[PDB]
Amino acid sequence: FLKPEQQLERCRRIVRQRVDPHIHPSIAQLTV
Amino acid sequence: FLKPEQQLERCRRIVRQRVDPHIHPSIAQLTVESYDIPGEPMPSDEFFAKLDRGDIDFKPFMLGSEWGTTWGTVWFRLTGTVPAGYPKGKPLELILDLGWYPHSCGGHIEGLVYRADGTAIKAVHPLNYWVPFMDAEGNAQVPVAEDGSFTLYLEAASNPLLLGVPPFIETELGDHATGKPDEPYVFKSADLAEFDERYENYSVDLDVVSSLMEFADKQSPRYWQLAKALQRSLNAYDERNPESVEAARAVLAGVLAKPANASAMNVSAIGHAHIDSAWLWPVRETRRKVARTVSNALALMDADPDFKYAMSSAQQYAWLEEDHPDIFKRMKRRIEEGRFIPVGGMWVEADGMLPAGESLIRQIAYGRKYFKEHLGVEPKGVWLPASFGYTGAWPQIARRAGYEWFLTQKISWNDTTKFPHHSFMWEGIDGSRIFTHFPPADTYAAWCKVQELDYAEKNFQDKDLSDRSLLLFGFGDGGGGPTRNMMEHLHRYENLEGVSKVSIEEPNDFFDKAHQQLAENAGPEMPVWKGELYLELHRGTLTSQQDMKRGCRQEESLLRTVEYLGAAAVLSDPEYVYPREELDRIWKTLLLNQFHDILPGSAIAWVHREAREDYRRDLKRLAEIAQDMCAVLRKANPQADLLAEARISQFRNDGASWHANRINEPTDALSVLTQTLDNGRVLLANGVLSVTIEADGTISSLLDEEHGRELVPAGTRLGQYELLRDEPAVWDAWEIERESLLMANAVTGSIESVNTENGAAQVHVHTADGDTVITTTITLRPGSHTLDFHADIDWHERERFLKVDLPLGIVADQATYDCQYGLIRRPIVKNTASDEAKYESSTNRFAIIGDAGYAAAVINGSVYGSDASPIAGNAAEGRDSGTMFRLSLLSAPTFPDPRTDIGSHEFDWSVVADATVDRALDAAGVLNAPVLHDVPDITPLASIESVNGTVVLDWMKLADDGSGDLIVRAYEAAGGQADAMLHVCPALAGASVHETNVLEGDDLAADLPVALQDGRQNAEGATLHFGPFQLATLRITR
Amino acid sequence: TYDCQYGLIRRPIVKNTASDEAKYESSTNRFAIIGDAGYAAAVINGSVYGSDASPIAGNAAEGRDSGTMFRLSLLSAPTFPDPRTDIGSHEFDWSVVADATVDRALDAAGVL
Amino acid sequence: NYSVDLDVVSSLMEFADKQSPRYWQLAKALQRSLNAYDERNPESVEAARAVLAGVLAKPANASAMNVSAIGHAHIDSAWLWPVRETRRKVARTVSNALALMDADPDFKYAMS
Ligand SMILES: OC[C@H]1O[C@H](O)[C@@H](O)[C@@H](O)[C@@H]1O
Ligand SMILES: [Zn+2]
Ligand SMILES: [Zn+2]
């Protein structure tokens, strides 16, 4: 009834899309 | 002392560095000029017309530059020259590169090559980018001058890659053509090169040996012999001496000539290339993809004998015939030889669940007609490699259409359950059986690799009764097709130890041989699967893009009404002319819109916008045509009384099926009463029902009179809206996950107004969530057992799923749903993991849930997906028991369309308290019938009344000939034996009736029952004996 | 539909999966009912418990239409625990009810 | 012969590389042979032997090794018995070998 592989795939997708971008959110642009 | 892994690594390095570069060594450089079209694609005929009239610049282009826009086209003029007397016995091919991504194929840029005359030669693909230029003795595909100068054209299409290595990423590059360089690619290579077959053969042999070693069952003599042969071949090959590549090839000959095992299965391979009519690209690119695929197949046939290719969709055939007459003529000559096999005999590869039975019949009829009148080929089987499940009425329709076998491979995508058989007999709900085969390779586009063959051998589920499997090889789902490498690999696998015997064979011969072998071996113990082919995946396709389903159902109902009205008018007014051409065009447009990617709703925004425009235009045109036919009928029938607002719905109860009935007919029952309670609760009471509405606009008490039954369990609210978080890991638009359930959030509303327009009570409820507003009208009509709900929704959510709860208070183990031509039963209580996988099924206009002594029905307007669960309560609180039945309304995917179903939507449904099969069919027919105006109350052309059993006359139409005969299609809906007698209009006096097939071909199989005994009879008084879901078809001649 | 101790049970006649095939020999309690939507027939037994049911798919080219083969287990002759098992005289009673409902099946089972 | 065929088929199934066509074909052949054999009818043992003939006539694999077999019987001059019993053991072994040669052609025996 519980499929661990689906949980692993969902975890990888969630980390890639919804968790990692929220780390280091840009607040200002720099001039080079 | 010998390490096979080191040998494998050395072989891979040698192939990468010293063998592959020697294949196609460049001998000349080409000069390139470009002409860009940022907008719509430019037809080839008029392009070449102005080209030979001028009007084109062809600005010079340098190698390594960026050329393409997001959806534009580039025409490249390639000018080159050959060296002096260079073609010394070698083909001297031509190589073009457009910036192919190595880990991608069939989802990005492509191109086609044209001569100066205007005839295509061969398309270019990431894995197949060689174009034949000259022959060994000097024969060239293009004119060449004495100086050797030559010119060619290349039409390159630049399409965005919507499926990258990060799968399912939201994008905005699927709406239209922007004319901007969103992601340009480099060209960097256009060379004229020579062809050396020895190096290619050596590469193929090395690859085959390595792949055989990968699955050679280590610690066996074969593995070590292969390793030793590989080592010796690598040692004997010298790059400095070109001739040594011959001697190395002589080393691998010993191990490659070993005969196959005695028990190895026999595999028949047929060239295939799946092309979706509309998926991640519009139809305009679909036509070009079809042309490129056919050109590639023709080039492969020319360059290689003993190669066969199969093509399925008739619409693509028509598009190719209309666009490229020369390619069509070449394909026709190939067909006459028997090397190009048309399969399927259908307009498109439509979905197997959503379309109605008449839609599938029209698929088959139009496909067969096109195949007979334009190709002279009559397919013997159904070709549907990809489909999100099948209704289970397919075997009867296919068997009555003359088909003999079925093909399918999508069932392999199940989440938890493995289908018990690969080759078997699929039996419908009626009893008709057809021979079905599932390719064990689990794919329709094989790359011709040893690992695919080994997986197919180990995956077969009928090894004890058969040893025949079908392999479909080539590049699919984006065009392309089989390549030369695939043919060479197959030729190597023809007779090899450790690899099954693979031969090129027509699918008909394979199916005949497999069926005969199964009959011989199995006998009494022969596999049979009865029911539907449910797919445990893509369960969200029943709700995504609700406009598609709504338009499909509305168009089908309107087409039924229009054809009935036309048949009635023709038999009354001889001067009337039936609009056959316009109706045929509308039917073909709908059939194309019924594809397995448009109807589910998993394409880009452009495809769905075009489909919505087509639906709206066709609906308006059909309404106008129906109005014209109604006016003609009114003119021809002055004695009848006009009906200002009336509907015609098949199988209306009380023996008034095909009669036009008013919306508001007077009733003996008094007007329904309304009452306001203390806490804002609203009480509605007609003579048969009592409805109580709470302050939040949800039904809490639905009492049925004269039965003492409460239809709402205590502690549950009816009509409550639920919001779910839909964030699937894969296939966002396709999938709704189990984790989405069990976390629905209740959304509360309030009562706004109560009104009584024509004696029917109406209650208005507003529900708000934030930029999303639902306005619900709850209607109770006097003298009726049905409670009606109408909903207007302003969907503005994101990644959310909307559902409505309809508790029933009936303990039932199974629920009955409507099928295309019958009924199906699905479990409500899920005991095993297999049963749990069916947590989201489909409904066809109604569902019935009931115990032994009582039943209630839920009727829906244009909703397909739904689910049912038990409700086990406790007497310590008040909750007794029941069944929670929920309907899926809206969803908001993001991957294919960033804004999906954002806007206004309308829904209609109803609850029938005391319901049987007849009452459910009546309610479903009445609700789905289109509304028309000013119709005479004319006698129906034909009528079918059943003394015992339930017989529904599904369709009446005119024969698709000049004869003008009347075709009547009926079926048994209850599920048991039924007896009926046929009646006809007084105008049809002395007419004769006889039985035909679904295609009106007058030829039917002897195995199937007829249900019309004594053969030809008179139209009036004919007797019919319907079995369970008989689906009889009759033809009446005046 | 078969009789239970204090109710009724439903068992599949058409066996699609391997799990369904494992139930090729079930138990009956004084009667069994087999019927479609509009008709039903009952088999009443005196003291027989084991039985089985299978489909009958015929062809119109010969005359066999369709049906359900319902068989009752009467006697067996094992040898390991008892060398002579059920060797001798036995009596059995059963009946077929043409137009049968739950009430009629219960009536016939009680009377017999 | 039937016993030898059944033993060979069973031992082949024991190492038949399950999930391969050979394993399932051997299983089906064994089941059919067991079903076709009736102990009450002595002649049926012939017909059962005809069922296993199909799977026992399959040719060997191309890469299979070639094995040469020679009759052997190791006899220790003195180990757990005196020499007087060693002489009798030698005589018995030679007598058995001679009887096997008489009762079967194409048999060879080696002595050291
Ligand atoms: O399975 C999803 C997807 O698979 C393949 O790429 C094609 O058949 C598509 O038509 C389909 O939508
Ligand atoms: Zn597809
Ligand atoms: Zn020793």
mmCIF file of C-alpha atoms in Angstrom, chain B residues 760-958:
data_model
loop_
_atom_site.group_PDB
_atom_site.id
_atom_site.type_symbol
_atom_site.label_atom_id
_atom_site.label_comp_id
_atom_site.label_asym_id
_atom_site.label_seq_id
_atom_site.Cartn_x
_atom_site.Cartn_y
_atom_site.Cartn_z
ATOM 1 C CA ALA B 760 -39.674 24.984 -8.603
ATOM 2 C CA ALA B 761 -37.643 26.078 -5.591
ATOM 3 C CA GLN B 762 -34.172 27.489 -6.253
ATOM 4 C CA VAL B 763 -31.531 28.210 -3.601
ATOM 5 C CA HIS B 764 -28.440 30.316 -4.339
ATOM 6 C CA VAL B 765 -25.162 29.604 -2.526
ATOM 7 C CA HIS B 766 -21.911 31.575 -2.777
ATOM 8 C CA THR B 767 -18.584 29.933 -1.921
ATOM 9 C CA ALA B 768 -15.360 31.938 -1.792
ATOM 10 C CA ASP B 769 -11.684 31.081 -1.387
ATOM 11 C CA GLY B 770 -9.841 34.151 -2.707
ATOM 12 C CA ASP B 771 -10.062 35.088 -6.400
ATOM 13 C CA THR B 772 -12.109 31.874 -6.807
ATOM 14 C CA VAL B 773 -15.906 32.113 -6.622
ATOM 15 C CA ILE B 774 -18.425 29.267 -6.899
ATOM 16 C CA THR B 775 -22.103 30.112 -7.406
ATOM 17 C CA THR B 776 -24.370 27.101 -6.885
ATOM 18 C CA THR B 777 -28.083 26.833 -7.653
ATOM 19 C CA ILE B 778 -29.893 23.988 -5.886
ATOM 20 C CA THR B 779 -33.186 23.234 -7.625
ATOM 21 C CA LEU B 780 -36.177 21.170 -6.520
ATOM 22 C CA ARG B 781 -38.923 20.599 -9.088
ATOM 23 C CA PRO B 782 -42.468 19.485 -8.197
ATOM 24 C CA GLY B 783 -43.476 15.970 -9.172
ATOM 25 C CA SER B 784 -39.888 14.763 -9.626
ATOM 26 C CA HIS B 785 -37.582 12.462 -7.671
ATOM 27 C CA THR B 786 -34.439 14.363 -8.720
ATOM 28 C CA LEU B 787 -32.591 17.171 -6.937
ATOM 29 C CA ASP B 788 -30.624 19.375 -9.329
ATOM 30 C CA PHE B 789 -27.350 21.266 -8.883
ATOM 31 C CA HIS B 790 -25.907 23.894 -11.224
ATOM 32 C CA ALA B 791 -22.477 25.415 -10.602
ATOM 33 C CA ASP B 792 -20.602 28.385 -12.063
ATOM 34 C CA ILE B 793 -16.932 28.408 -11.058
ATOM 35 C CA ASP B 794 -14.352 31.160 -11.586
ATOM 36 C CA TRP B 795 -11.240 28.995 -11.342
ATOM 37 C CA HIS B 796 -8.085 30.938 -10.452
ATOM 38 C CA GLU B 797 -6.211 28.439 -8.251
ATOM 39 C CA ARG B 798 -2.768 26.924 -8.823
ATOM 40 C CA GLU B 799 -1.836 23.254 -8.338
ATOM 41 C CA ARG B 800 -5.151 22.495 -6.628
ATOM 42 C CA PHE B 801 -7.882 19.902 -7.168
ATOM 43 C CA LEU B 802 -11.592 20.628 -6.695
ATOM 44 C CA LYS B 803 -14.113 17.969 -5.674
ATOM 45 C CA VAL B 804 -17.700 17.797 -4.429
ATOM 46 C CA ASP B 805 -18.947 15.353 -1.786
ATOM 47 C CA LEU B 806 -22.215 13.448 -2.296
ATOM 48 C CA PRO B 807 -22.879 11.082 0.625
ATOM 49 C CA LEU B 808 -25.545 8.484 -0.108
ATOM 50 C CA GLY B 809 -26.147 6.469 3.071
ATOM 51 C CA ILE B 810 -26.231 3.090 1.305
ATOM 52 C CA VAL B 811 -23.932 0.197 2.215
ATOM 53 C CA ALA B 812 -22.854 -1.434 -1.053
ATOM 54 C CA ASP B 813 -19.830 -3.562 -1.894
ATOM 55 C CA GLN B 814 -19.746 -2.467 -5.550
ATOM 56 C CA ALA B 815 -20.897 0.520 -7.594
ATOM 57 C CA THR B 816 -22.455 0.374 -11.061
ATOM 58 C CA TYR B 817 -21.231 2.854 -13.675
ATOM 59 C CA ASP B 818 -22.224 3.389 -17.286
ATOM 60 C CA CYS B 819 -20.128 2.024 -20.145
ATOM 61 C CA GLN B 820 -20.153 2.870 -23.852
ATOM 62 C CA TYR B 821 -22.758 0.189 -24.631
ATOM 63 C CA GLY B 822 -23.490 -1.314 -21.225
ATOM 64 C CA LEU B 823 -22.642 -1.211 -17.520
ATOM 65 C CA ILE B 824 -19.575 -1.930 -15.398
ATOM 66 C CA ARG B 825 -19.155 -2.760 -11.710
ATOM 67 C CA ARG B 826 -16.268 -1.376 -9.669
ATOM 68 C CA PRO B 827 -15.402 -2.181 -6.044
ATOM 69 C CA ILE B 828 -16.215 0.364 -3.355
ATOM 70 C CA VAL B 829 -14.501 -1.521 -0.526
ATOM 71 C CA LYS B 830 -10.823 -1.998 -1.405
ATOM 72 C CA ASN B 831 -9.339 -5.050 0.321
ATOM 73 C CA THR B 832 -6.176 -5.719 -1.711
ATOM 74 C CA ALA B 833 -3.517 -3.494 -3.241
ATOM 75 C CA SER B 834 -4.922 -4.202 -6.711
ATOM 76 C CA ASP B 835 -8.318 -2.823 -5.672
ATOM 77 C CA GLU B 836 -6.698 0.227 -4.066
ATOM 78 C CA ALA B 837 -5.087 1.166 -7.394
ATOM 79 C CA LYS B 838 -8.573 1.919 -8.781
ATOM 80 C CA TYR B 839 -9.096 4.957 -6.541
ATOM 81 C CA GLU B 840 -10.135 7.205 -9.460
ATOM 82 C CA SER B 841 -12.431 5.748 -12.124
ATOM 83 C CA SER B 842 -14.544 7.186 -14.947
ATOM 84 C CA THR B 843 -18.302 7.700 -15.173
ATOM 85 C CA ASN B 844 -20.435 7.951 -18.314
ATOM 86 C CA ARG B 845 -23.304 10.367 -17.611
ATOM 87 C CA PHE B 846 -24.413 8.547 -14.440
ATOM 88 C CA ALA B 847 -23.553 6.164 -11.618
ATOM 89 C CA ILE B 848 -25.783 3.898 -9.514
ATOM 90 C CA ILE B 849 -25.140 2.836 -5.912
ATOM 91 C CA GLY B 850 -27.629 0.617 -4.121
ATOM 92 C CA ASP B 851 -28.184 -2.334 -1.819
ATOM 93 C CA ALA B 852 -30.559 -5.264 -2.397
ATOM 94 C CA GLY B 853 -33.760 -3.310 -1.727
ATOM 95 C CA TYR B 854 -32.884 0.286 -2.637
ATOM 96 C CA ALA B 855 -30.676 2.328 -4.942
ATOM 97 C CA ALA B 856 -29.769 5.950 -5.652
ATOM 98 C CA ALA B 857 -28.179 7.494 -8.728
ATOM 99 C CA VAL B 858 -25.837 10.410 -9.386
ATOM 100 C CA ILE B 859 -26.289 12.016 -12.814
ATOM 101 C CA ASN B 860 -23.564 14.260 -14.240
ATOM 102 C CA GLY B 861 -23.564 16.691 -17.148
ATOM 103 C CA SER B 862 -19.992 16.651 -18.456
ATOM 104 C CA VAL B 863 -17.956 15.183 -15.569
ATOM 105 C CA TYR B 864 -15.952 11.996 -16.144
ATOM 106 C CA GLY B 865 -13.669 11.322 -13.168
ATOM 107 C CA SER B 866 -15.050 10.300 -9.786
ATOM 108 C CA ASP B 867 -14.412 8.034 -6.813
ATOM 109 C CA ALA B 868 -16.303 6.125 -4.127
ATOM 110 C CA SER B 869 -15.325 5.105 -0.597
ATOM 111 C CA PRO B 870 -17.099 3.501 2.369
ATOM 112 C CA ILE B 871 -18.311 5.389 5.436
ATOM 113 C CA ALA B 872 -18.156 3.235 8.576
ATOM 114 C CA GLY B 873 -19.716 5.122 11.480
ATOM 115 C CA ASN B 874 -20.328 4.434 15.153
ATOM 116 C CA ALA B 875 -23.592 4.395 17.090
ATOM 117 C CA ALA B 876 -21.917 6.147 20.039
ATOM 118 C CA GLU B 877 -22.006 9.449 18.114
ATOM 119 C CA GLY B 878 -24.731 9.185 15.470
ATOM 120 C CA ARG B 879 -22.945 8.232 12.253
ATOM 121 C CA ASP B 880 -24.522 5.018 10.964
ATOM 122 C CA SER B 881 -22.857 4.133 7.630
ATOM 123 C CA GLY B 882 -22.878 5.094 3.981
ATOM 124 C CA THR B 883 -20.955 5.600 0.759
ATOM 125 C CA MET B 884 -18.952 8.758 0.054
ATOM 126 C CA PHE B 885 -19.186 9.397 -3.697
ATOM 127 C CA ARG B 886 -17.146 12.350 -4.962
ATOM 128 C CA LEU B 887 -16.900 13.950 -8.403
ATOM 129 C CA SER B 888 -13.758 15.581 -9.795
ATOM 130 C CA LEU B 889 -14.466 19.079 -11.121
ATOM 131 C CA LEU B 890 -11.285 21.056 -11.816
ATOM 132 C CA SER B 891 -7.500 20.841 -11.628
ATOM 133 C CA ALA B 892 -4.615 23.258 -12.214
ATOM 134 C CA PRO B 893 -1.533 21.601 -13.731
ATOM 135 C CA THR B 894 1.455 23.711 -14.732
ATOM 136 C CA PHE B 895 3.944 21.769 -16.897
ATOM 137 C CA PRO B 896 2.320 21.608 -20.370
ATOM 138 C CA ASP B 897 0.169 24.715 -19.818
ATOM 139 C CA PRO B 898 1.268 27.307 -17.216
ATOM 140 C CA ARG B 899 -2.352 28.507 -16.856
ATOM 141 C CA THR B 900 -4.674 25.500 -17.134
ATOM 142 C CA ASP B 901 -8.460 25.867 -16.795
ATOM 143 C CA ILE B 902 -8.169 29.438 -15.488
ATOM 144 C CA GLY B 903 -11.494 31.155 -16.093
ATOM 145 C CA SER B 904 -15.222 30.492 -16.072
ATOM 146 C CA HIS B 905 -16.652 26.968 -16.067
ATOM 147 C CA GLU B 906 -20.178 25.559 -15.845
ATOM 148 C CA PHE B 907 -21.247 22.235 -14.341
ATOM 149 C CA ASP B 908 -24.579 20.441 -13.985
ATOM 150 C CA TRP B 909 -25.438 17.357 -11.949
ATOM 151 C CA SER B 910 -28.334 15.757 -10.107
ATOM 152 C CA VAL B 911 -29.251 13.168 -7.485
ATOM 153 C CA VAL B 912 -32.014 10.610 -8.103
ATOM 154 C CA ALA B 913 -33.465 9.141 -4.913
ATOM 155 C CA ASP B 914 -35.364 6.009 -6.004
ATOM 156 C CA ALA B 915 -33.363 4.966 -9.054
ATOM 157 C CA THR B 916 -33.190 1.884 -11.258
ATOM 158 C CA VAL B 917 -31.275 1.291 -14.485
ATOM 159 C CA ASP B 918 -34.198 2.645 -16.517
ATOM 160 C CA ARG B 919 -34.528 5.759 -14.353
ATOM 161 C CA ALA B 920 -30.775 6.414 -14.428
ATOM 162 C CA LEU B 921 -30.736 6.069 -18.222
ATOM 163 C CA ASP B 922 -33.753 8.384 -18.443
ATOM 164 C CA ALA B 923 -32.119 11.060 -16.283
ATOM 165 C CA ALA B 924 -28.813 10.796 -18.163
ATOM 166 C CA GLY B 925 -30.519 11.097 -21.547
ATOM 167 C CA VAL B 926 -32.716 14.028 -20.538
ATOM 168 C CA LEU B 927 -29.868 16.021 -18.978
ATOM 169 C CA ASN B 928 -27.455 15.561 -21.900
ATOM 170 C CA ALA B 929 -29.944 16.269 -24.698
ATOM 171 C CA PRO B 930 -29.406 19.610 -26.475
ATOM 172 C CA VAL B 931 -32.038 22.334 -26.178
ATOM 173 C CA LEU B 932 -33.801 23.520 -29.334
ATOM 174 C CA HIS B 933 -36.788 25.700 -30.189
ATOM 175 C CA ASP B 934 -39.999 25.570 -32.239
ATOM 176 C CA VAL B 935 -40.128 21.842 -33.010
ATOM 177 C CA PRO B 936 -43.252 19.939 -34.106
ATOM 178 C CA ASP B 937 -44.340 16.922 -32.069
ATOM 179 C CA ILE B 938 -43.802 14.404 -34.850
ATOM 180 C CA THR B 939 -43.990 10.631 -34.592
ATOM 181 C CA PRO B 940 -40.551 8.985 -34.265
ATOM 182 C CA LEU B 941 -39.242 7.261 -37.379
ATOM 183 C CA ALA B 942 -38.587 4.001 -35.518
ATOM 184 C CA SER B 943 -39.432 2.683 -32.064
ATOM 185 C CA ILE B 944 -38.261 -0.304 -30.028
ATOM 186 C CA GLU B 945 -40.450 -1.482 -27.146
ATOM 187 C CA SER B 946 -39.396 -4.322 -24.848
ATOM 188 C CA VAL B 947 -41.929 -6.667 -23.274
ATOM 189 C CA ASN B 948 -39.212 -7.896 -20.903
ATOM 190 C CA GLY B 949 -35.739 -6.478 -20.426
ATOM 191 C CA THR B 950 -34.368 -3.043 -21.239
ATOM 192 C CA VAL B 951 -33.530 -2.196 -24.857
ATOM 193 C CA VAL B 952 -32.215 1.259 -25.776
ATOM 194 C CA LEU B 953 -32.329 2.473 -29.378
ATOM 195 C CA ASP B 954 -29.038 4.352 -29.388
ATOM 196 C CA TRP B 955 -28.902 5.916 -32.843
ATOM 197 C CA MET B 956 -30.797 6.550 -36.071
ATOM 198 C CA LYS B 957 -29.138 7.886 -39.211
ATOM 199 C CA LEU B 958 -29.131 7.684 -43.000
#
